[PDB]
Write a protein that binds this ligand. Structure first.
Ligand SMILES: CCCCCCCCCCCCCC(=O)OC[C@H](COP(=O)(O)OCC(O)COP(=O)(O)OC[C@@H](COC(=O)CCCCCCCCCCCCC)OC(=O)CCCCCCCCCCCCC)OC(=O)CCCCCCCCCCCCC
Ligand code: BCL
Ligand code: BCL
Ligand SMILES: CC[C@H]1c2cc3[nH]c4c(c3C)C(=O)[C@H](C(=O)OC)c4c3nc(cc4[nH]c(cc(n2)[C@@H]1C)c(C(C)=O)c4C)[C@@H](C)[C@@H]3CCC(=O)OC/C=C(\C)CCC[C@H](C)CCC[C@H](C)CCCC(C)C
Ligand SMILES: CC[C@H]1c2cc3[nH]c4c(c3C)C(=O)[C@H](C(=O)OC)c4c3nc(cc4[nH]c(cc(n2)[C@@H]1C)c(C(C)=O)c4C)[C@@H](C)[C@@H]3CCC(=O)OC/C=C(\C)CCC[C@H](C)CCC[C@H](C)CCCC(C)C
Ligand SMILES: *[C@H]1O[C@H](CO)[C@@H](O[C@@H]2O[C@@H](C)[C@H](O)[C@@H](O)[C@H]2O)[C@H](O)[C@@H]1O[C@H]1O[C@H](C(=O)O)[C@@H](O[C@H]2O[C@H](CO)[C@@H](O)[C@H](O)[C@H]2NC(C)=O)[C@H](OC(C)=O)[C@H]1OC(C)=O
Ligand SMILES: *[C@H]1O[C@H](CO)[C@@H](O[C@@H]2O[C@@H](C)[C@H](O)[C@@H](O)[C@H]2O)[C@H](O)[C@@H]1O[C@H]1O[C@H](C(=O)O)[C@@H](O[C@H]2O[C@H](CO)[C@@H](O)[C@H](O)[C@H]2NC(C)=O)[C@H](OC(C)=O)[C@H]1OC(C)=O
Ligand SMILES: COC(C)(C)C/C=C/C(C)=C/C=C/C(C=O)=C/C=C/C(C)=C/C=C/C=C(C)/C=C/C=C(\C)CC/C=C(C)/C=C/C=C(\C)C(=O)O
Ligand SMILES: COC(C)(C)C/C=C/C(C)=C/C=C/C(C=O)=C/C=C/C(C)=C/C=C/C=C(C)/C=C/C=C(\C)CC/C=C(C)/C=C/C=C(\C)C(=O)O
Ligand SMILES: COC(C)(C)C/C=C/C(C)=C/C=C/C(C)=C/C=C/C(C)=C/C=C\C=C(C)\C=C\C=C(C)\C=C\C=C(C)\C=C\CC(C)(C)OC
Ligand SMILES: CCCCCCCCCCCCO[C@@H]1O[C@H](CO)[C@@H](O[C@H]2O[C@H](CO)[C@@H](O)[C@H](O)[C@H]2O)[C@H](O)[C@H]1O
Ligand SMILES: [Fe+3]
Lengths: 40, 299, 315, 273, 62, 71, 60, 60, 71, 39, 39, 55
C-alpha cells in the first residue's frame, strides 16, 4: 500500500518537531561543552 | 613509483634488496643537502698551551682549533662554543656558579669513545669511520636512544646479554641445543630491528634457507657481528657509566643513562650517511697511527 | 536463474521437514548430548582466550578492538617443562587448550553419531579425524620435546609468529619431506576441486550435478565427463571414484603434515642438514669464506635467560 | 583402445584452428592443432631442462637447478649458460600451458560441454605468468623469476618471503591461505558426503540426495545444493590461485617495506589514532 | 650404529609404499565404468585390472 | 515537504535515521576520546587554559642554536 | 505518543533497545576501568584529591 | 529543467545524492583532521599566524 | 551531430559521463595533493615564489651512494 | 513514473534545498577562512 | 529507441551543459594559475 | 569510404575512444615519471634549466 496524505501530514509534523527538539538539546550540549573547553 | 633492486646473492636465490625509488631519493637528498662542510687543515709549529686538555694532547694547535669548530658544527651549531664552555674560560669544567659543565664532561668522554670506535672497531667501521656527526646529525640528541624497560627487551643484546643462536649444528637433536621456539621468536624480533635499522631485509645478511650459515651468507653478516661487539663496548664502557653526569631530564625512568643501538649510527641506511667519509679529514678522532695509509700528523 | 520455486508445505516429505529418517530426527540443527557438551566446553575455551587477550590491554575496549590481531594467550615459560605453570604465565593457556581439545573430540562424536543415525557411511568422521590428528600433534610434539612452552599461542598474528619461528628453530621446514608431501596434497586438493567443480558445472546442463543418479544410473553427463579427461590427459576416473581421489587428497594433507610435525625436534633437529645428508640441497657458489680464526670468533652462544637485574655501571 | 561407450562420441568438429587436418586421436589422447603445439613445446622445453641439468653440477633429481639470469641483464636475453637457457624454457612453458588450455577448449566443444575447465585452468596459468612474466617485468628484470629446480625454487620462495621480513603479514597472502585451507576442508566434506551415501554400511540401502542435504545442513547450518557445492569448490580453488597472484605481484612492485608495517593504517584509523 | 638410516627416512619410504598402494587402489576404482576397453586387437583391461561393475539396491517403498 | 513520506516508507526511514545518528555520535566521542585536548576521562577536571594544545609554528627563524638544560 | 507502537512491533524494539543499552553500558564501564583516573578496582579507595589526573598542557 | 525528474526517479536519485554528499563530507573532514595545518581538535585554538605551514623552497 | 543519441542511449550516457568526470577530478586532485608543489592543505598559503620546485638536478658526494653495493 | 505537476513541485523543493545547502556551506567556508585561511 | 524529436532537443542540453562546465573549469584554472602557475 | 559497412561504427567509436584514452594516459604517466618532464613539480623551470640525460 502506502501513506495517505493526512497521515503523512501527521507524521511529518511529529518528525519535524522531533528533529528540531533533538537539535535543541544538542545546542545546549554544545553550549555546555564550549563553556567548559572551547575548541577555537 | 619504480622500484630499485640490488642483487646481493647468486642468480635465482632471490637474495635482493628492494627500494622505492622516490622515497630513497628523498631520504638521500635530506642527507646530502644538510651534510656539513669541513674546514681545511694547517700545520703550525710549537709547544701546546692548554690548561685542561686530556684527550687531544697529540695534535697541533691549529688542528685542535679546527676540531673544536667541527664539534660545535656537529653537535651544537656552527658557532655554539657556549654549548660546552664557559666562554670566558675555555679551560673551565664548571660554570661561574661552580656547578659542573656537564656537556663538556660528556664531550670529553665522547672523544675517548670516538677514538675507541675508530681505533679498536676498524673491523666494523673500516675506513669510513665515525665522527660526532654520525650520531648527532648536528643536534644534541642522537636517534635510537633507549633505556631499561622490561627484562626481555631485545635491545639488551647490545648491553649485558650474549648469545642469540638457536639453530642446531647437526641433524639429530642433542643436549647441546635446547633452545625454545620462544627463543627463536626473540631472535626474530631482534633481527627485524636490525633489518629496519639499516633499511635492508634479511637476505642482506643471510641465505634464509639456512640462517645459521656463514658460507652462504653475504660478507655483511660478519661486519654486522662486529657491530654487536662494538655496541656492547660503547654501551657498557662509555654511555651507561655517564649516569651521574647528566641532568635527570636525560635519564630513563629507572634512572639509567641513554644507550645506543644500530639505528643510532645507521639511521635507516645501509651505511651511516650513505657512506660519506668524514673521519679521514679529522685526525683528532682516528685512534690510529694512519688512516688508509695517510699518517697521523702527530703534534 | 531468477525463476525460483518456493515450497510452503515441507520439502523432504522455503521450509524444512520436521520428522524422522528412522533413528534420525529432522528439523532442528542436530546437536544431541555430545553437541551440547561440545558447545559448553568450547564456549569456555573461547571465553578464557578472549578474557586473557582483553586483560592484556588492561581491559581497554578500544585497544581490545584496535590491537585484536596482535593479542595472544601465550604458552608457559620453557623452564617449567611439563609441570603446571603459574596461572598468569600459561596456566590459562593450558586450561583453554584442554577445553578446546575436549570440545573438538565431542564435536567428532557428534558428527560420528549423526552419520550413523542418517544411515550413512563413516567417511566424514574419518576425514575430520585426519584434521584432528594434525591438531593433536601441536600437543604431542611439545610433549615429546618435553615443554609446554613449545605449544602454539592462541592469537591471530601470534600463531603466525610461532609458525615462522618453528621453521627457524628447526632449520627450515621446507626440507622436511613430510611438509613437502603435505604441500603436494594441499595443492592437489586445489587442483582436484578446480577440475571437478569445473567438470560438473560443464555438464550441469545434462544433469551431471545429480551425481548420485549418475553413479547409480550412468547418464551421458557422466560419459562426457569421463571422455573429456581421458581425451585430455589419457586416463579418467568415474563419477564415484573422483570423490575417492578428492577424499584421499584432502585427508593426506593433514595426515602427512602431522607426521612431519611429530618428527621435528624428536628425530631431526635441523631439516636443512637432513636435506644435505640425503641429497636434497642444491649447491650455490660460496658467498663468503671464513678464516680459521673467524670460525672461532663468529660462533656465538646459544640464547640463554633474560637479565633479571638493571645494572648501574657506577664505575 | 576405447571405453566401451566411447566410439559414438569420436566425431569431427569443435576444433578452433586446424579444421579436420589434426582432428584425430592417438591412443586415448585427442590431438588437434594444439596437441601438436603442446608436444612441440613440451619436448623442446623438457630437452632444454635436461641440457640445463647436464651442464649443471649433478644429475640428482632434487638438486638440478636451472637459474634465471642476473638482474644486471634487465629485460634482455642473457647468455644461455648465464640464465638465457632459463628464459628459453620459460617461453616453452608458456607455449605448452597456453596450448594445453586451448586443446581443452577443443575437447569440451567436441563433447558439447561448457568451457568451465579451460577457464578454471586459466587461474593456474595466471599465477605462473605473474611469477615469471608480470612481476619480473614490473621489477624490470627477468632475473626476478623463480629458478627451475625441485628444491632450489623453495630456496627462492624462502628468500622472497624474508625480503619482506615477515611475509605472513601480507594481507593478500592471508586471504589466499584462507582460500587454500577452506578449499581443502570443502573437498574433504563433499568427497565424504557423496561416498557415504553411495557406500552406506553393509546391509543398508543406497542413500539419497535428501540424506546428504540433511547432513550438510547439520554441518554448516544451511543447505548448499548439488550445483552449489561445485560452484563453491570452483570458487575456492580458483580464488586461491587468483589471490596468490595478487599477493606476490604487490610484493615488490607496489609494496617494498616489511609487511608488518603495512598494518600501520589500521592502528591510525581516526576513531582510535 | 646406522649413520645414514634415520627415522625420517624410514617413515618416508613407509609412506611411499602406502601411497603407491593407494594409487593402485584408486585406479582399480576408476575402472568400474567403461571397461574392458574396446580395441581393434580385442578387449583390453590396462593395468591394474579394474574392479567389477557395482550394483546398487534402493530403499523399498512397497 | 510532507509528500517525501509518500515517496519513502515512513517506518523504514526512522530506522535508517536513528542508526545513522547513533554511529555518528559514537564516532565523534571516540575521535575526541583518543585526542589529547579532549581525553576528558583523564583530563576533564583541567581548566580550559591548562588543557593541552597542539604544536605551533615557531614564528621565528627556527634556527637559534640551543643551550643545555641546567644540571 | 503511544501510536508509535502501532508502527513498530515492541517485540522487535525492546530486544534491540536492551541489546544496545547492555553493550553501551559495558563499553562505558570498561573505558573507565582502563583509564588511570577511574581504575576503581585497583584504586577506588583513594579519595578524589589524590586520584590521577591526565597531564596538563606541555606549555606549562 | 524539471523534466529531468520524468527521466530519473526521485526515489533513486535522492538516496544516491545523500549518500554521495555524506561520503564526500566525511572524506574531507578526515583528510583535514589528519593534516598538521588543520588538526583542529588538538590545535583549533591557535591563531592563524601560529598554525603550522608546510616547508617553502630554499632556492639556494 | 545529434544523431549520435540515436546510436547511444542518452539516459545511460549521462551516468557514464558523470562517472568518468568524477573519477578524473578525484585522480587529478589526489595527484596534486600528493605532490610537493601543490600540497595545498599544508602549504597553500605560500607565495608562488616560495612554493617548492623540482631540482634542476640532484647532487651527491663522490663516495656516497643511495643504494648498497651489489652485483 | 511521475506527472509533470509532481515533477514541477519536486524540482522546486529540490532546487531550494540545493540552494539552502549551498548557502550554509558558504557561511561555513567563510567562517573557516576567517579562522584559518588556506591561501 | 530514440526519436529525432528527442535527439535534437537532447543535443541542445548536452552541448550547452558541456560548454557551461568547460567555462566554469576555465575560470577555476584562471584562479589556480593566478595563485600558483605551473609553467 | 565504405569501411563503416564492414565494421559497426557504434562499436568502432567506443573501441577508438577507449584506445585513445589508454594511450593518452600512458603517455602522460610516462612523462610524469620522467625527470625532464615531471611537469607538476618542475614545470616552471626553463628549457635550459630542465634535466637532461647523460651524454
Ligand atoms: C607400475 C607397477 C609398480 C606399481 C607401484 C608403483 C606405481 C604405482 C602407480 C601405478 C599406477 C598405474 C600405472 C599404469 O600402468 O597405468 C596405466 C594407465 C593407462 O591406462 P589403462 O586404462 O590402465 O590402460 C589402457 C591401455 O593399456 C590401452 O589403451 P591404449 O593402447 O590406447 O593406450 C596407450 C597406452 C600405452 O601405455 C603406456 O604408455 C603406459 C604409460 C605409463 C606412464 C607412467 C609414467 C610414470 C612415471 C612418470 C615419471 C615422470 C616422467 C616425466 O596408454 C597411455 O597412453 C598412457 C596413458 C596415461 C598417461 C599418464 C601420464 C602421466 C601420469 C602422471 C605421471 C606422474 C606425475 C608425478 O595409465 C595411467 O593410468 C597413469 C596415470 C594414473 C596415475 C596418476 C597418479 C598421479 C599422482 C599425482 C600425485 C603425486 C603426489 C606426490
Ligand atoms: C504545540 C505547541 C507548540 C509551541 C507553542 C508555544 C507557545 C504557545 C509559546 C511558545 C514559546 C516558546 N517556545 Mg514553542 N511550541 C512548540 C515547540 C517548540 C520547540 C520545539 C523543539 O519544537 C522549541 C525549541 C520551542 C521553544 C520555545 C521558546 C523559544 C519560547 C519561550 C518559552 C520556552 O522557553 O519554552 C520552553 C519549552 C521548550 C523549549 C520545549 C517544549 C515546548 C512546549 C510544548 C511549548 C508549550 C508550552 C508553553 C511554552 C507554556 C507557556 C506559554 C503558555 C501560552 C502559557 N517551542 C510546539 C510546536 N511555544 C512561548 C513564546 O514564544 O514566548 C515568547 C509561547 O508563548
Ligand atoms: C616460515 C613458515 C614455514 C612453514 C611452517 C609450517 C608449520 C610450522 C606447519 C606448516 C604446515 C603446513 N604448511 Mg608450511 N610453512 C612454510 C611454507 C609453506 C608454503 C609455502 C608456499 O611456502 C605452503 C603452501 C605451506 C603449506 C602448509 C600445509 C601443507 C600444512 C598445513 C596443512 C593444513 O591443512 O593445515 C591447516 C589445518 C589445521 C591446522 C588443522 C586444524 C584442525 C582442527 C581440529 C580445527 C579446530 C578448529 C577450532 C574448533 C575452532 C575454534 C578455535 C579457537 C578460535 C581457538 N607451507 C614455511 C617453510 N607450515 C603444518 C604441517 O603440517 O607441517 C608439516 C605445520 O604445522
Ligand atoms: C582434511 C583436512 C581439512 C579439514 C577437514 C575437516 N574439518 C572439519 C571437518 C572436516 C572433514 C568436519 O566435519 C568439521 C566440521 O564440523 O565441519 C563443518 C571440521 C571443522 N573444521 C573446523 C575448523 C578448521 N578446519 C581447518 C582445516 C582443515 N579441516 C583441513 C584443511 C582449519 C584451519 C585451516 O586452521 C580450521 C580453523 C571447524 C569449523 C570444524 C570443527 C568445529 C568444532 O570442533 O567445534 C567445536 C566447538 C567450538 C569451537 C565452540 C563454539 C562455541 C560457540 C561459538 C558459543 C556460542 C554460545 C553457546 C550457544 C553456549 C552454550 C549453550 C548450550 C546450552 C548450547
Ligand atoms: C587454479 C587453481 C589450481 C589449479 C587448477 C587446475 N590445474 C589444472 C587444471 C585445473 C583446473 C587443468 O585442467 C589441468 C589439467 O589437465 O589437469 C590434469 C591442470 C594442471 N595442473 C598441473 C599442475 C599443477 N597445478 C598447480 C596448481 C593449481 N592448479 C592451482 C592451485 C600446481 C602447483 C601449485 O604446483 C601444479 C604443479 C598439471 C598436472 C596440469 C597442466 C598440464 C599441462 O599444462 O601440461 C602441458 C605441459 C607439460 C606436460 C609439461 C611442460 C614442461 C615445460 C615445457 C618445461 C618445464 C618448465 C617448468 C616451469 C619447470 C618447473 C620446475 C619445478 C620444479 C619448479
Ligand atoms: C667552577 O668551579 C671550578 C672549581 O670548582 C673552577 O675551576 C677553577 O679552575 C680550575 C683549572 C682549577 O682546577 C680549579 O681549582 C679552579 O681554580 C671554575 O673556574 C668555576 O669557578 C667558579 O666556581 C668556583 C667554585 O668552585 O664554586 C668558584 O670558586 C670559589 O668559590 C667556591 C664556593 O662557591 C669555593 O669553594 C672556592 O674555594 C672558591 N675558589 C676561588 C679560586 O675563588 C670560582 O670563584 C672564583 C673567584 O674563582 C668561580 O669562578 C668564577 C669566575 O666565577
Ligand atoms: C644484574 O644481575 C643479573 C643477574 O646476575 C645479570 O644478569 C646476568 O648476565 C646477563 C647478561 C644474563 O642474560 C643473565 O642470564 C645473567 O647471567 C645482569 O646483567 C646484571 O648484572 C650485574 O649484577 C650481577 C648480579 O648478579 O648482581 C653481577 O654479577 C656478579 O655478581 C654476583 C653477586 O652480586 C654474582 O652472583 C655473579 O656470579 C657475578 N657475575 C660475574 C660475571 O661476575 C654483575 O657483575 C658482573 C661483573 O658481571 C653485574 O654486572 C654489571 C656490569 O654491573
Ligand atoms: C581532499 O580534496 C578532495 C576531496 C580530494 C578534492 C576533490 C573534490 C571534489 C571532486 C568535489 C566534488 C564536488 C561535487 C561534485 O559533484 C559536489 C556536488 C554537490 C551537490 C550536487 C550538492 C547538492 C545538494 C543538494 C541538496 C542537499 C538537496 C536537498 C533537497 C531538499 C532538502 C528537498 C527536500 C524535499 C523534497 C525532495 C520534497 C519533494 C516533493 C515531493 C516528492 C512532492 O511534492 O510530491
Ligand atoms: C594526473 O594527471 C593525468 C591524469 C596523468 C593527466 C592526464 C589527463 C587526461 C588524459 C585527461 C583527459 C580529459 C578529457 C579528455 O577528453 C576530458 C573530457 C571531458 C569532457 C568530455 C567533459 C564533458 C562534460 C559535459 C557535461 C558536464 C554535460 C552536462 C550536461 C547537462 C547538465 C545537461 C543535462 C540535461 C538533461 C539531462 C535534460 C535532457 C533532456 C530531456 C530530459 C528532455 O528533452 O526531455
Ligand atoms: C566477554 O566475552 C569476550 C568478549 C571476551 C568474548 C570474545 C572473545 C574473543 C574475541 C576471542 C578471540 C579469539 C581468537 C582471535 C583466537 C585465535 C586463535 C588461533 C588463531 C589459534 C591458533 C592455533 C592454536 C593452537 C594450535 C592451539 C593448540 C592447543 C592445544 C593442542 C592444547 C592442548 C592441551 C591439552 C590437550 C591439555 C592440557 C591440560 C593438561 C593435560 C596438560 O593438564 C594440565
Ligand atoms: C527530553 C526533551 C527535552 C527538550 C524539549 C523537547 C521539546 C519537544 C517539543 C514537543 C512539542 C510537541 O508539540 C506538538 O505535539 C503535537 C501533538 O501533541 C504534534 O502534532 C502532530 O499531531 C497532530 C494530531 O495529534 C496533527 O494534527 C499535527 O499536524 C501534527 O504535527 C506536533 O507535531 C508537535 O509539534
Ligand atoms: Fe562432486
Amino acid at each position: 500500500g502506502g501513506m495517505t496524505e493526512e497521515e503523512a501530514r501527521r507524521f511529518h509534523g511529529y518528525m519535524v518537531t522531533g528533529t528540531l527538539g533533538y537539535v535543541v538539546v544538542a545546542s545546549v550540549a554544545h553550549f555546555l561543552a564550549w563553556s567548559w573547553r572551547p575548541w577555537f | 613509483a619504480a622500484t630499485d633492486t640490488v642483487q646481493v646473492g647468486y642468480r635465482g636465490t632471490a637474495m635482493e634488496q628492494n627500494y622505492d625509488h622516490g622515497d630513497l631519493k628523498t631520504k638521500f637528498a635530506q642527507v646530502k643537502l644538510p651534510q656539513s662542510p669541513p674546514p681545511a687543515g694547517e700545520s703550525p709549529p710549537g709547544p701546546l698551551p692548554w690548561k685542561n686538555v686530556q684527550v687531544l694532547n697529540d695534535i697541533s694547535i691549529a688542528e685542535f682549533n679546527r676540531t673544536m669548530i667541527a664539534m660545535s658544527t656537529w653537535v651544537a651549531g656552527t658557532g655554539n662554543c657556549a654549548y660546552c664552555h664557559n666562554v670566558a674560560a675555555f679551560q673551565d669544567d664548571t660554570l661561574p656558579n661552580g656547578k659542573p659543565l656537564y656537556t663538556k664532561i660528556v664531550a670529553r668522554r665522547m672523544l675517548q669513545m670516538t677514538r675507541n670506535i675508530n681505533g679498536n672497531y676498524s673491523q666494523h667501521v673500516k675506513n669510513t669511520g665515525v665522527t660526532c656527526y654520525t650520531c648527532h646529525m648536528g643536534k644534541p640528541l642522537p636517534n635510537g636512544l633507549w633505556f631499561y624497560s622490561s627484562q626481555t627487551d631485545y635491545l639488551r643484546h647490545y648491553l649485558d646479554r650474549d648469545g642469540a643462536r638457536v639453530i642446531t649444528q647437526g641433524v639429530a637433536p642433542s643436549n647441546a641445543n635446547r633452545s625454545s621456539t620462544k627463543q627463536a621468536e626473540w631472535t626474530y624480533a631482534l633481527m627485524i630491528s636490525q633489518s629496519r635499522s639499516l633499511g635492508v631485509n634479511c637476505t642482506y645478511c643471510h641465505n634464509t634457507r639456512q640462517f645459521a650459515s656463514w658460507r652462504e651468507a653475504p660478507p655483511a653478516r660478519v661486519t654486522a657481528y662486529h657491530g654487536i661487539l662494538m655496541l656492547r663496548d660503547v654501551n657498557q664502557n662509555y654511555l651507561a657509566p655517564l649516569q651521574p653526569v647528566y641532568p635527570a631530564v636525560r635519564l630513563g625512568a629507572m634512572g639509567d643513562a641513554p644507550k645506543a643501538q644500530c639505528v643510532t649510527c645507521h639511521n635507516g641506511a645501509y651505511k651511516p650517511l650513505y657512506g660519506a667519509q668524514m673521519a679521514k679529514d679529522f685526525p683528532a678522532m682516528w685512534g690510529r697511527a694512519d688512516w688508509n695509509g695517510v699518517p697521523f700528523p702527530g703534534i | 536463474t531468477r525463476v525460483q520455486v518456493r515450497t510452503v508445505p515441507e520439502p523432504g516429505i522455503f521450509s524444512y521437514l520436521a520428522g524422522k529418517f528412522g533413528d534420525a530426527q529432522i528439523g532442528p540443527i542436530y546437536l544431541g548430548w555430545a553437541g551440547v557438551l561440545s558447545l559448553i566446553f568450547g564456549f569456555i575455551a573461547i571465553e578464557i582466550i578472549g578474557l586473557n587477550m582483553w586483560a592484556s590491554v588492561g581491559w581497554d575496549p578500544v585497544e581490545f578492538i584496535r590491537q585484536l590481531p596482535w593479542l595472544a594467550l601465550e604458552p608457559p615459560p620453557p623452564q617449567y617443562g611439563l609441570r603446571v605453570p603459574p596461572l598468569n604465565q600459561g596456566g590459562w593457556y593450558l586450561m583453554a587448550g584442554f577445553f578446546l581439545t575436549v570440545s573438538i573430540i565431542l564435536w567428532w562424536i557428534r558428527i560420528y553419531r549423526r552419520a550413523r543415525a542418517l544411515q550413512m557411511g563413516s567417511h566424514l568422521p574419518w576425514a575430520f579425524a585426519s584434521a584432528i590428528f594434525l591438531y593433536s600433534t601441536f600437543f604431542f610434539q611439545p610433549l615429546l620435546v618435553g615443554s609446554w612452552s613449545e605449544m602454539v599461542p592462541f592469537g591471530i598474528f601470534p600463531h603466525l609468529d610461532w609458525t615462522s619461528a618453528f621453521s627457524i628453530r628447526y632449520g627450515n621446514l621446507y626440507y622436511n619431506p613430510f611438509h613437502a608431501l603435505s604441500i603436494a596434497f594441499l595443492y592437489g586438493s586445489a587442483v582436484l576441486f578446480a577440475m571437478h567443480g569445473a567438470t560438473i558445472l560443464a555438464v550441469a546442463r545434462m544433469g551431471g550435478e545429480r551425481e548420485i543418479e549418475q553413479i547409480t544410473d550412468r547418464g551421458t553427463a557422466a560419459e562426457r565427463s569421463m571422455l573429456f579427461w581421458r581425451w585430455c590427459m589419457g586416463f579418467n576416473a568415474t563419477m564415484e571414484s573422483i570423490h575417492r581421489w578428492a577424499w584421499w587428497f584432502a585427508v593426506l594433507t593433514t595426515f602427512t603434515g602431522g607426521i612431519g610435525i611429530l618428527l621435528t625436534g624428536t628425530v631431526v633437529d635441523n631439516w636443512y642438514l637432513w636435506g644435505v645428508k640425503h641429497g636434497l640441497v642444491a649447491p650455490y657458489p660460496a658467498q663468503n669464506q671464513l678464516t680459521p680464526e673467524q670460525q672461532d670468533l663468529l660462533r656465538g652462544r646459544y640464547q640463554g635467560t633474560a637479565p633479571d637485574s638493571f645494572p648501574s655501571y657506577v664505575v | 583402445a576405447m571405453l566401451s561407450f566411447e566410439k559414438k562420441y569420436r566425431v569431427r568438429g569443435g576444433t578452433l584452428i586446424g579444421g579436420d587436418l589434426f582432428d584425430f586421436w592417438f591412443g586415448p589422447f585427442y590431438v588437434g592443432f594444439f596437441g601438436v603445439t603442446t608436444i612441440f613445446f613440451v619436448t623442446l622445453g623438457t630437452l632444454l631442462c635436461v641440457w640445463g641439468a647436464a651442464m649443471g653440477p649433478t644429475w640428482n633429481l632434487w638438486q638440478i637447478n636451472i637459474a634465471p639470469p642476473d638482474l644486471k641483464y634487465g629485460l634482455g636475453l642473457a647468455p644461455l649458460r648465464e640464465g638465457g637457457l632459463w628464459q628459453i624454457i620459460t617461453l616453452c612453458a608458456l607455449g605448452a600451458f597456453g596450448s594445453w588450455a586451448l586443446r581443452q577448449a577443443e575437447i569440451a566443444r567436441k563433447l558439447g560441454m561448457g568451457m568451465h575447465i579451460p577457464w578454471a585452468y586459466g587461474g593456474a596459468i595466471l599465477a605462473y605468468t605473474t611469477l615469471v612474466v608480470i612481476r619480473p617485468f614490473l621489477l624490470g628484470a627477468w632475473g626476478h623469476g623463480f629458478p627451475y629446480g625441485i628444491f632450489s625454487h623453495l630456496d627462492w620462495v624462502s628468500n622472497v618471503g624474508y625480503q619482506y621480513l615477515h611475509f605472513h603479514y601480507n594481507p593478500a597472502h592471508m586471504i589466499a591461505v584462507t582460500f587454500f585451507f577452506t578449499n581443502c576442508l570443502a573437498l574433504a566434506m563433499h568427497g565424504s558426503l557423496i561416498l557415504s551415501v553411495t557406500n552406506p554400511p553393509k546391509g543398508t540401502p543406497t542413500g539419497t540426495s535428501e540424506q546428504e542435504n540433511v547432513f550438510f545442513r547439520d554441518l554448516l547450518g544451511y543447505s548448499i545444493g548439488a550445483i552449489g557445492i561445485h560452484r563453491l569448490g570452483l570458487f575456492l580453488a580458483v580464488g586461491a590461485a587468483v589471490w596468490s597472484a595478487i599477493c606476490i605481484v604487490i610484493s615488490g612492485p607496489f609494496w617494498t617495506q616489511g609487511w608488518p608495517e603495512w598494518w600501520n593504517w589500521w592502528l591510525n584509523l581516526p576513531i582510535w589514532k | 650404529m646406522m649413520e645414514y638410516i634415520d627415522g625420517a627416512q624410514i617413515a618416508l619410504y613407509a609412506f611411499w609404499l602406502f601411497f603407491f598402494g593407494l594409487i593402485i587402489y584408486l585406479r582399480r576404482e576408476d575402472k568400474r565404468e567403461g571397461y574392458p576397453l574396446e580395441s581393434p586387437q580385442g578387449p583390453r583391461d590396462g593395468w591394474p585390472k579394474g574392479a567389477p561393475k557395482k550394483t546398487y539396491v534402493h530403499r523399498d517403498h512397497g | 515537504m510532507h509528500r517525501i513520506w509518500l515517496m519513502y516508507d515512513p517506518r523504514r526511514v526512522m530506522v535508517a535515521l536513528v542508526g545513522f545518528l547513533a554511529v555518528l555520535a559514537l564516532v565523534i566521542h571516540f575521535v575526541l576520546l583518543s585526542s589529547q585536548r579532549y581525553s576528558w576521562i583523564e583530563n576533564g577536571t583541567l581548566g580550559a587554559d591548562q588543557a593541552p594544545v597542539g604544536a605551533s609554528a615557531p614564528a621565528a627563524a627556527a634556527e637559534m642554536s640551543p643551550l643545555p638544560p641546567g644540571r
